[PDB]
Design a binder for this molecule. Structure first.
Ligand SMILES: Cc1cc2nc3c(=O)[nH]c(=O)nc-3n(C[C@H](O)[C@H](O)[C@H](O)COP(=O)(O)O)c2cc1C
Ligand SMILES: Cc1cc2nc3c(=O)[nH]c(=O)nc-3n(C[C@H](O)[C@H](O)[C@H](O)COP(=O)(O)O)c2cc1C
Lengths: 400, 401, 400, 402
């Protein structure tokens, strides 16, 4: 029983309500529950801890299949898969055994509260006072809490800010979402990705136990500067995002295809008698498929490289991580423009009647248009040209 | 010497405050329709001798563009209204022209149409038209797609004589009161964009058309298309309005993008960037958006002068004049569609992830353009130009070319 | 042992005279003898018959390495590699044994005076009269004959055009180029691909012996309609052309990169200090590499699909061939659009002084601008579009 | 003078189109064509009538450039540059230089060339030294490198950099001197993939005297004029708009040639059941996109031409706003012309086909011509200038190219 077959089954059912749920917005609890019951939430967990133990390429095909049915869910399951690796990326051998196992057998959803909204991306303003026993008390509020609402395990981030020399000490921690003080709000709203629960989360004196703290204080920053296994964060995240777009593009293409075949009318002023026999429609579809062909092929090739580097572990070099990031940055560019182009252009061949909300054909674009702004594609493109021309690798961070 | 453009700039700014709410709510925008009535711009294209502004096509288009930038739906609704009355000059009589123009101007009337089904065979048009001995007609049927029928004062309707007669298959053009017995404009329009265009159905139940309300002979439009006479300006006029409605929306999207970048946008600090307004790639994008519009606008404006030149020739216009005009308009339609789609979508790249929030409503510009750009296939506008360039062919005159 | 390393050595040697040989035109005769002496000519002939027995991906990477250094040499070697397979495609076992060994132990060049891609069967110049012994005699002048001049074994097509019951039948033959009446002219000239020797070739009462005829009369046309193993010609030929274009694209890009780092000057009116630190040059380089990334990944996937359908033998179904042709039809389009974009856009970052003939930078564009017109990329695109939308497979022929 | 200059240009364009192929492949100087231009009287096209000129407006002069450019990219460039050279005398020179030189140009029908750009570390780094002399003039030493028209010209517009123990140190001097002046050696060393007959070679200056009254304006007059956005700062808008129209001419040339081949030589793709080349729906689409791209680019260009005229007729009354706005428009036109000309000159081959790659048609000359000159200055910073204006209201830094 492979997880791609299970992913396909869930997709079939979610296409019926895709239009309903997209317009409605809000949380998609019913669908999130169906994903729990499938058991795909422990897809990247090894079999030793009651997981599927799937490789990255296999896991990506599952993400692509979910994303085609619904970009929000594809993104929800996407960010979910990126969260758990943080334990084995920086956390201890004790935390790895405990946290992976309890995710697997409880079928826990995972969310995170990392990015905020103040001066700029690199200006995180939530406190974390170090208690005498070792723990930390989180004070403040986040704004882009990807999938935090309705989740079980929350991968939170914070900063130490006081007179003591610990300024910009980035703490990571995985706590249960039922902890006192935490409040993931129902204020998420965007043009697309409407059911991705990327809202705010207020922290009113939320405690973090010694075992819940992931790695040393400012551990991620050290791994980024040294280009160690922790710096694989961005390469992993950015490939899943890219594959979510390509998924949405495939769904948009598949949805248009069937419409053209059964609903679209030929333009009779031009002497056309069949919509599927229109030369320019035929050309439009060729153009879309070929843009996906190129992008998908780059994506799958990049997935195998991620797996190769993943298998090395701590033995990975800056050269390995750099090249991978440049390739993934290249796939991010291809995915974005191919998804934006297809999701918009698909309307040309559908026609005027296809702007009726009952089809919801603009949901593909709205989903891609929204999440493509997560990080600027211009600098993904810029980071590749820097490598091409000067061999310069991207500075490791949360996105690069 | 009152300024038609400045009046439009006053409405836009008033609507700018409520622009986002209207888009999300949808339905009909009766409050905005009344503001345009009270401004008097509804008589923009009416000759001064009848009480209108007496404005030319270029000035008229500038007022349309300005309104379209504030609101895509209202720009289209006003835009389409302006093309309705000219129909009277194209095929109607001198009597009817003096009469119906005066009533529109002096009474500040909105106009709508239940006119052409441009991709349906004439015998499959829903509006049937039975003749009478006095010369009039009785209309029966439900038109699936109208333009501004709801809330209009005067309605320009096409019916087809689908009964055994010499008239069998003829298209009848009529201008009747919207409150004529049997006329029921439905509020059943629904789309991702152009939500307040009131482009729903309109039912006709034994609607009588009087002899003096019938515009020209039976099938006068189709006869005019075949001969490239004054009636064949229908497609050029309409297609050009649409193009400028698209260009208006893109300026709106570009204006709104700009203002967000200056006040709200944050600098990508991972790339050592201090200010959002000084980002090399953001600045490039704005250059490209402006450059693409620069080219489309300049072509549009050239086409309006050409439209005016052909308009001024009256009935003595030639198949060459009309043919060349439609080629230019076809080109502008393509330039407008491509630029508007690019800019209304591309603007998001410089705004940022926070700009996707409903309270800004930045996707309305795209939804409006993406929707109405499907009115007729841009691929064939492009092909008609290429057929002219390569083979010297002029488009076959009709409702959309 | 390693044919790619041998090619790198040839490219190394040729890159000193690349500029001059493009300018001069004519035959690349010295470089054609470097190719023979290397042994690469029998690359796609099985070990057992004297060749390298190389598989399709490997042979493609040799084409790419050659095409990168010189576009004419990439084409000429690429097309030669498609000629010999013709024997085991439509010919018998005895001829496969006889001809392959001859080609191998002699290290023969092959040319072609084969198909006319835009001509109705009863309009082809080269006509074949049936002889009493079972052979044919050719008469006419074919105008596009790549590699005919200087080749050892010529692949010639002829049509029977008379009152015979075998009217309009395409005869495929393999004869020595020195055969009486075979006169490959020295009349090729073009903006690019100047040294591909694709001039006309005259046939005047040229005898083709019974055993030199490949298969039955009209054996290719039959193979096409049935989608037999003979119909692999198009996907093979097309995929090689696609990899030639990408090779040339990599050539231009590597040459641009060298100039940008060594010669290019910074635009100081904007305040730029180094040409490598120019944001838009960096962007330009990202977009070129990104376009290549997608096109290359897609190309590679198609070589593995080619190998799979090649290894199936006669058990290949119309479906396999159809799916492969659509994939390669996409690849052909990506290679065309990427190569023309990069080889022209590369001038943007190079600058005015780089237009001097001594760099010869325009040769990359001229080469791909020339051969991209071999068959129309518009109908490559439409065939992909027809498959996507209507499940229709391309019409089996010499180009599709 | 009294006739329509665009009609005269068309006559010259017709005559040159019969030898365009051979002169492109041969390269070198187009001496016979340059002489055709001299004899036509069009070199005094922008000179006022009071000094013996044609007194044409900027839109008309630009139409002449476009018409010449469609026939021959190199001749369009050459005439275009000549039309940008002359204005410099009134832009920064005195009343007497205006009357004297313009009259000489009209009466003698002088070709003009320039010697301004160099081959140093970057385009602002100039090493052609100018030593002052106690009569007010200067002495020039060094080598210029992109000297379009310098060879065979009668009047050479040269830019020097002052070397002196004074405040004049590092000041830029503009001068108009006879090309035959002792020391000045225009070289015959111009080679390029395109613009092959523009004679943009090197020019050596060996103890070249620049007499006091041949100096145009005070020391650093251009640099001052740029900073103040005064009438002298119209150089960039004028030159850049002319270049854009050279590219558009060439684009039209490419499309016209393509069209005629498509109609006469091209064959239909018979595997797709296409009957005639002109009926192919994708060929039709291609020509439509070519025409559409040029429709927009040409209209933009014409708009900018009228705006230049407007600004030009204000004289000294022009403001930094007027100048900066004008330059924004032209920078946009430069971009539209660049990418339209490139896209069409290359794209035209898809509808022409393989047999049209033969050198006897010389079909790649349009692209090679555009591809070459499009690199005069970077289109990325024309686009960026427009972005700075749109986003922040900022006007371009006045210089020789912006
Ligand atoms: C560089 C180049 C190489 C070519 N090589 C061959 C060849 O080896 N065999 C062949 O039959 N045709 C060859 N052709 C011919 C093309 O198939 C032909 O140009 C096209 O199908 C029809 O040409 P047209 O579009 O000019 O009518 C070649 C064409 C070019 C431009
Ligand atoms: C065809 C052509 C003609 C040119 N003509 C001139 C000229 O007449 N005067 C001049 O100062 N520069 C001329 N230039 C040069 C530009 O002003 C600029 O210095 C040059 O393109 C920058 O060189 P780079 O790109 O190698 O840095 C010309 C360039 C080209 C390609």
């Amino acid at each position: 029983n492979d997880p791609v077959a299970v992913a396909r089954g869930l997709a079939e059912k979610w296409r019926a309500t895709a239009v309903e749920r997209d317009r409605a917005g809000g949380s998609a609890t019913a669908e999130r529950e169906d994903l729990r019951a499938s058991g795909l939430l422990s897809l990247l967990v090894p079999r030793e801890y009651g997981g599927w133990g799937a490789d990255w390429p296999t896991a990506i095909e599952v993400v692509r299949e979910i994303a085609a049915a619904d970009g929000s869910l594809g993104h929800l399951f996407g960010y979910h898969l990126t969260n758990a690796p943080m334990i084995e990326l920086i956390g201890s051998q004790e935390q790895e055994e405990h946290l992976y196992t309890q995710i697997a057998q409880n079928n826990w959803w995972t969310g995170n509260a990392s990015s905020e909204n103040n001066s700029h991306v690199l200006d995180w303003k939530v406190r974390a006072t170090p208690t005498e026993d070792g723990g930390y008390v989180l004070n403040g509020t986040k704004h882009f809490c990807s999938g935090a609402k309705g989740s079980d395990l929350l991968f939170v981030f914070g900063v130490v800010q006081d007179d003591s020399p610990q300024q910009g000490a980035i703490i990571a921690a995985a706590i249960p979402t039922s902890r006192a003080g935490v409040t993931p709000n129902d204020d998420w709203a965007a043009i697309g990705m409407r059911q991705t629960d990327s809202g705010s989360t207020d922290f009113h004196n939320v405690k973090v136990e010694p075992d819940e703290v992931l790695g040393a204080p400012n551990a991620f920053v050290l791994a980024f500067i040294q280009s160690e296994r922790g710096s694989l964060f961005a390469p992993i995240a950015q490939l899943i995002f890219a594959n979510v777009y390509l998924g949405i593009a495939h769904g948009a293409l598949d949805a248009a295809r069937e419409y053209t075949r059964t609903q679209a009318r030929p333009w009779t002023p031009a002497g056309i008698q069949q919509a599927t026999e229109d030369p320019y429609t035929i050309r439009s579809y060729g153009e879309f498929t070929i843009a996906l062909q190129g992008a998908d092929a780059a994506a799958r090739e990049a997935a195998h490289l991620l797996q190769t580097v993943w298998d090395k572990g701590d033995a990975l070099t800056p050269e390995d991580r750099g090249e991978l990031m440049v390739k993934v940055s290249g796939v991010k560019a291809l995915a974005t423009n191919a998804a934006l182009n297809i999701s918009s252009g698909v309307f040309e061949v559908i026609g005027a009647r296809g702007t009726h909300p009952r089809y919801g054909f603009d949901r593909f674009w709205r989903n891609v248009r929204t999440h493509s702004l997560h990080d600027p594609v211009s600098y993904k493109i810029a980071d590749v040209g820097k490598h091409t021309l000067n061999g310069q690798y991207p500075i490791p961070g949360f996105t690069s």
